[PDB]
Design a protein around this nucleic acid. Structure first.
Lengths: 301, 94, 96, 80, 73, 76, 111, 109, 109, 94, 82, 98
DNA sequence: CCGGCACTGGAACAGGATGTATATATGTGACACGTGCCTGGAGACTAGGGAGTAATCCCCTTGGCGGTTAAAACGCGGGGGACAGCGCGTACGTGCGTTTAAGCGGTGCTAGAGCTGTCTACGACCAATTGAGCGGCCTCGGCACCGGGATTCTCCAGGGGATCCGG
DNA sequence: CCGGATCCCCTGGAGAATCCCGGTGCCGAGGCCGCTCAATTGGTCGTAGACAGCTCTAGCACCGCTTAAACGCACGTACGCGCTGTCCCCCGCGTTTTAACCGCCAAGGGGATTACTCCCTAGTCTCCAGGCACGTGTCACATATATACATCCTGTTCCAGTGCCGG
């Protein structure tokens, strides 16, 4: 069970959902939370800094909260999964968004997975979700290669999914045992304003002050793909150029540069002129208690 | 034979309520009791100094909160202040 | 012209400053630093002139001792120039 | 008021080093020393303001600063 | 009195080893022989400057006075 | 010559950027002031993602205007 | 007369409020002692004890032991950043010092 | 010396900014055959064909933020000294030992 | 009828006040009761310490050809004496400065 | 307003007793007052701790003697103890 | 009457204490200076403990007196009282 | 026949004493030293077993901290072996010497 | 101009030796739970002073503005010190045989830790009151600053003084 | 053999820093007066502990046995300490600039003061149950033993250097 770390990028998620087989969906990075977006049909994915210090200092939390779901029928109908895989939070949130909405042309593998898992229990459902070869391959294809060499405390971040399954905003978390129901919307808004308000209050309770207090959050909105909307042409040109540049970024991100850098430095050293420019482009100031040297030497008696 | 006051029972109850399957031998238990006594003495002394500096003849919850903020560093002080405020609110309400 | 070798003026400054007790840090720039640091703790906060003077004097005393420890660390390492490495070692030994 | 840590000028650090008995001073240490001060004040003022927050006062007195310094073991004489 | 060149040449030749003779070895040999080395060691370095260009003594791996010297073949 | 940068949470930060400067120095200043690595944030101008390797004058960023900082980090 | 219950249980707290109040009265820190001050002090003490015991239990589970030894307490106090500064001038008998290991970095994400 | 030091962190590569060390002008100041050979160790997106059909690099193919991040990570790993052979051998052994235990869970996943 | 209200300081033959020290001890919340001889002893110790410090400061001022004691003189007197330096090694004196401490290595050869 | 308690006149009288022809400045007087207050507070706190340790609710001459011995180093402590004992004996006689 | 048993803190003991301190190489002059520093620290702590014990009209140094002496110097010890 | 080069057994002992918390100082000679030192203050003085154990624990912790400081100073001075110079430097910095 | 045969050093690898973590089995002393009780915590009620609050005075803090430099900032030559490389030798790490005494276990004594009862003197509390100490004013001498010499410390220039080279 | 010219140590003089003397002014240190408030003196009363007596306990002394560890010696080796070299970076100095500071003025903010009241906790009484000392069952672990794995160290092996000589 490798499941390497995944980077949270809009183009990365767009390419990932394209690899999933679904054609009419993508993600967008909203910038202003006080603005209004058009057609935010699908749910929101929110990256927040997950720290267990609060839970350790608030150990009395296993009790059922007021916003927590009481019955099991709606949980059985909707797609909610626990965190049984170490690094499936991104996939958990993405599948929570995709499988809890209609009018979507899901991929054949995703369609048969949803059909098989329709009407199930969240624990074994998530366990079956984790045991998928195509899902793991898709996750690892877009996964960064550099973190796999690190193990050769930690700032962890987690996704939460906001979705209007039955006209009410439900929050889905990988680590939370029970989803919390806190969407009373359904009067005049298109579910966007309530999501913005809940994000605002989450940020307020997160920091509640002027100091940064480790300000690391990222909100993304799942939206139908704009290519078909623009087809049915400056908008088409900008959409296709964004798609191409994002695809290039995804291709470039997954390649490790260790061998390239090593080869470049070795070629410069064997060429002879390296010792010139490496002597001039020095970042740290010299004669500051740092032992800088041993470039062209052996040091083996 | 006289009796000696200690926090052994309360600390063990806290341990049970946080780690039901974990125990403490009576060699590090004395260490925990000494830590509790030292923290209590430091907080009480800081509260007494705060009362004396402001010409206060009584030690209220505000003095204890100020002593906790001064002594405990980082988010430990904030969490302790929140817990103390919640406990005081629950005690006053009931 | 007449230029002193590097070190003589430094020794003269050491002798002059150790023989006097003036304020090495300018009062007004230090006062603004105190005001801006206290802004994060409590906004719309006033400072007495005596409080600012006392805080500046305390910082002067703290920094002089830190520099003495830094100089001793440099001397221990067969070196004369003080370095950030020396300050880090001095603060780590003192528990800061 | 922002970016006033630069108010502690390089010669001001030089004067402190000369008072402490320093012949030669490095460059990057000029950025280091201010940072140390940027900690020390945060370790003192935060205490003093706390005293200011306890006496129902909106100004910082000299005696509060003296108490804050005494709490950390750096007792101050001449202000109370 | 006598020039330092011939005496340091004899000292470096008396090693009878492939490895070169260092400056410390020359200093200790001169001290044992009974020559003023502490007050004229820098002058000894100047002596090297009088023979390195000559070609009768070549540095092995060191640069300047520091290092080891060997007789040229 | 000043500039304002917003965050997704609405926090406002003030930076000093020359008109002929580049966004790499802006990211370096951001890292210096708040501490996040420069590679973990991206600049946004009117909803457009800033491209690395281009100066401020390339996209015509006016003085005392507003930009956005979107924090692209790792996770799950 | 109604049922007599301790003030510690009134506030939903484990540490004895009455004992803290008695110690404050006997300690003679001030002429008068407030009603809510013992509750606040006992709550702070209980929170600190709970945090230390939880960290010690985590260390013991890392050590595969079900009892907390002075080594576990020393490791828990020294590893934590805020507790180390609070207890930077204390000595723990049979506690030792932190070894030179890099196994602390473990981004575990599980139920 | 004879060999360029890549193993020990004592080399100044950790303290040297690879962003300034490697640039488009630096790459263009190299023999053509060396550049052609090195381009084969790069992704497909950053390589294109011009009028002559030879491999060419884009404007942002080398001075983008991701390359700088990769260089910084390489410098950090140099500081950790993970490139030394004495630890590279045990890294290889650790990587190979995983396949020995994976043979039981291969048939289930 | 009523005897003369002589001060306890005059009765015990010490300059520092006794009633003030006793009042501060009683109002300082140190203990429930305060003995009769405790304030006298504490005031005597305070007077001894003050006399020693003032004598050293006066000696320093005479060495400096100064008639009026200044904070610099107090700092010199406290730091020069080993016992006083141990007593007040963790204190800050306003307008006091530091003793001239130049090591041998600092001086030119 | 309100009277301020200080040892200015007492310090001046002691200085005149030891150095009749030597004056003192306002800053030096304030430093001396702060030193006296700090020493008084530290000795009183040590005596209170000594009384509390032995379950004693009163402060006698023994507590102050022990505080002086613990705080003041060596010969300074010995001379302070001698002076305090002489003062106590003189008070008892008269 | 016993005199001059500072050698009881033997050289292997100092070596092991430095090993716990992360020291891998120890010079021959470290042991004497370490013994002197330990003797000075013991003298200070024992003087404080003796003063505490004499204040209590006792001639037996209890563990609580040692804890109080250590705490008065800022080196409070946990596990022998409160 | 077979032996370890210097620097390996020392590291093994360092790890062993980092993972163990026994009394490195023998109890009886330390207690005898405490008894000898406690004669210049008061003669015919008794010590409890808990008191001498606490003294030994405190002294061991203080010496471990001092040795850590001296090792830090030696690493700062680009040296591996510790000298009395770094001991004096650490004592001065901590304020014990001056 | 140049390469098969006769010399070496140096990176890589294999095998023995050592230490350590892991898998079971012991028996054990210390930890966890039940019990008697007794004393300290809790429920009621009172009262008296410390604290909360309103109104007010003015000390002091904040804000602003005009000069005046004292001091910070920037630029350049360079001296010398930070850093690197090399060599050495001696001081320390590692190992082994030996001697020491530390540690464990049982025995015995007893001087002192700790608890208790009396009763006494010592300290808290309140009135009268009065002298010492605090607050405000004044003046005159000690010190900061000024300037002029005179002495002292620094550094570079001139020159006695030891030394290898060439007809 | 004895005239060249290079580098080393001493003194002298120019130049900057600082002591040393004396004048001037100014401002606060100490003395004095008025007041007021709290320290003294007197007396009473409550109880903290001083002291003598009893109990018991653990600290000291001593003995023996076992073996873990310290000691001393040997030997190797590698690390700290010169010694030298380099080179570049703060130091010192000159010129620019720039804002700190002294002085003044003004507004008002809240810190301190006084009065009023009110309610909150010390104090006392009585009840009762929470936790402490004690006893007892049980299991977590310190220990022991055997085995396999990870390091360490050294001895051996394969690949890259010179040195020779006539088509």
């Amino acid at each position: 069970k490798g499941w390497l770390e995944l980077e949270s990028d809009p183009g990365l998620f767009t390419l990932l959902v394209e690899d999933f087989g679904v054609k009419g969906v993508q993600v967008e990075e909203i910038y202003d939370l006080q603005s209004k977006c058009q057609g935010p049909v699908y749910g929101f994915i929110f990256l927040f800094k997950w720290i267990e210090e609060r839970r350790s200092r608030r150990k009395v939390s296993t009790l059922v909260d007021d916003t927590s779901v009481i019955d099991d029928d709606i949980v059985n109908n909707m797609f909610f999964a626990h965190q049984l895989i170490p690094n499936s939070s991104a996939t958990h949130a993405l599948l929570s968004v995709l499988l809890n909405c209609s009018s979507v042309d899901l991929g054949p593998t995703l369609s048969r997975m949803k059909d098989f898992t329709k009407g199930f229990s969240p624990e074994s459902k998530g366990y079956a979700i984790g045991n998928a070869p195509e899902l793991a391959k898709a996750h690892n294809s877009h996964a960064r290669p550099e973190p796999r060499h690190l193990p050769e405390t930690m700032e962890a971040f987690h996704f939460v999914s906001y979705v209007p399954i039955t006209g009410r905003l439900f929050e889905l978390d990988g680590l939370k045992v029970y989803p919390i129901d806190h969407g009373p919307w359904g009067e005049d808004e298109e579910w966007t304003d309530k999501a913005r308000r809940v994000i605002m209050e989450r940020i307020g309770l997160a920091t509640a002050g002027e100091p940064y207090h480790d300000i690391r959050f990222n909100l993304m909105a799942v939206v139908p793909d704009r290519r078909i909307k623009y087809e049915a042409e400056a908008c088409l040109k900008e959409e296709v150029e964004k798609r191409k540049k994002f695809k290039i970024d995804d291709q470039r991100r997954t390649h490790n540069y260790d061998e390239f850098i090593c080869t470049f430095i070795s070629m410069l050293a064997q060429e002879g002129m390296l010792a010139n420019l490496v002597e001039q482009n020095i970042s740290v100031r010299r004669r500051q208690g740092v032992s800088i040297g041993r470039l062209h030497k052996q040091r083996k008696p | 034979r006289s009796r000696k006051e200690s926090y052994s029972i309360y600390v063990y109850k806290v341990l049970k309520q946080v780690h039901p399957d974990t125990g403490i031998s009576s060699k590090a238990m004395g260490i925990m009791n000494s830590f509790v006594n030292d923290i209590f003495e430091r907080i009480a002394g800081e509260a007494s100094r705060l009362a004396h500096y402001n010409k206060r003849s009584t030690i209220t919850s505000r003095e204890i909160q100020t002593a906790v903020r001064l002594l405990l560093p980082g988010e430990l002080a904030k969490h302790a202040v929140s817990e103390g405020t919640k406990a005081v609110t629950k005690y006053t309400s009931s | 012209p007449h230029r002193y070798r590097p070190g003589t003026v430094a020794l003269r400054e050491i002798r002059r400053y150790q023989k006097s007790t003036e304020l090495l840090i300018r009062k007004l720039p230090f006062q603004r630093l105190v005001r801006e640091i206290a802004q994060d703790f409590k906004t719309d906060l006033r400072f007495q002139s005596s409080a600012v003077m006392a805080l500046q004097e305390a910082c002067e005393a703290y920094l002089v001792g830190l520099f003495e420890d830094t100089n001793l660390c440099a001397i221990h390492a067969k070196r004369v120039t003080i370095m950030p490495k020396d300050i880090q070692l001095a603060r780590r030994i003192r528990g800061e | 008021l922002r970016d006033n840590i630069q108010g502690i000028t390089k010669p001001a650090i030089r004067r402190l080093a000369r008072r402490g008995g320093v012949k030669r001073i490095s460059g990057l240490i000029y950025e280091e020393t201010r940072g140390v001060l940027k900690v020390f004040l945060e370790n003192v003022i935060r205490d003093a303001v706390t005293y200011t927050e306890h006496a129902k006062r909106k100004t910082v007195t000299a005696m509060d600063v003296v108490y804050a310094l005494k709490r950390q073991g750096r007792t101050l004489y001449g202000f109370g | 009195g006598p020039p330092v060149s011939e005496l340091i040449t004899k000292a470096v030749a008396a090693s009878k080893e492939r490895s070169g003779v260092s400056l410390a070895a020359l200093k200790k040999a001169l001290a044992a022989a009974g020559y003023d080395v502490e007050k004229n060691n820098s002058r000894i370095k100047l002596g090297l400057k009088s023979l390195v260009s000559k070609g009768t003594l070549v540095q092995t791996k060191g640069t300047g006075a520091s290092g080891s010297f060997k007789l040229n073949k | 010559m000043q500039i304002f940068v917003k965050t997704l949470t609405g926090k406002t930060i003030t930076l000093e950027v020359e008109p002929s400067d580049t966004i790499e120095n802006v990211k370096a200043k951001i890292q210096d002031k708040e501490g996040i690595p420069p590679d973990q944030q991206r600049l946004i101008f009117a909803g457009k993602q800033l491209e690395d390797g281009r100066t401020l004058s390339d996209y015509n960023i006016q003085k005392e205007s507003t930009l956005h900082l979107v924090l692209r980090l790792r996770g799950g | 007369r109604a049922k007599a219950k301790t003030r510690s249980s009134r506030a939903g707290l484990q540490f004895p409020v009455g004992r803290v109040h008695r110690l404050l009265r006997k300690g003679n820190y001030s002429e008068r002692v407030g009603a809510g001050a013992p509750v606040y002090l006992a709550a702070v003490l209980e929170y600190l004890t709970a945090e230390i015991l939880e960290l010690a239990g985590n260390a013991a589970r890392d050590n595969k032991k079900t009892r907390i030894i002075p080594r576990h307490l020393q490791l828990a106090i020294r590893n934590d950043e805020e507790l180390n500064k609070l207890l930077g001038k204390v000595t723990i008998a049979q506690g030792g010092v932190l070894p030179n290991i890099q196994a602390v970095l473990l981004p575990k994400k599980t139920e | 010396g004879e060999e360029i030091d890549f193993e020990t962190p004592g080399s100044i590569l950790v303290n040297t900014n690879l962003r300034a060390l490697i640039n488009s002008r630096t790459f263009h100041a190299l023999p053509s055959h060396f550049q052609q050979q090195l381009l084969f160790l790069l992704p497909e997106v950053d390589r294109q064909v011009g009028t002559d059909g030879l491999l060419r690099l884009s404007s942002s193919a080398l001075n983008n933020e991701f390359f700088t991040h990769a260089a910084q990570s390489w410098r950090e790993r140099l500081a950790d000294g993970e490139f030394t052979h004495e630890m590279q051998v045990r890294i290889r052994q650790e990587m190979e030992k995983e396949k020995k235990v994976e043979q039981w869970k291969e048939k289930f996943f």
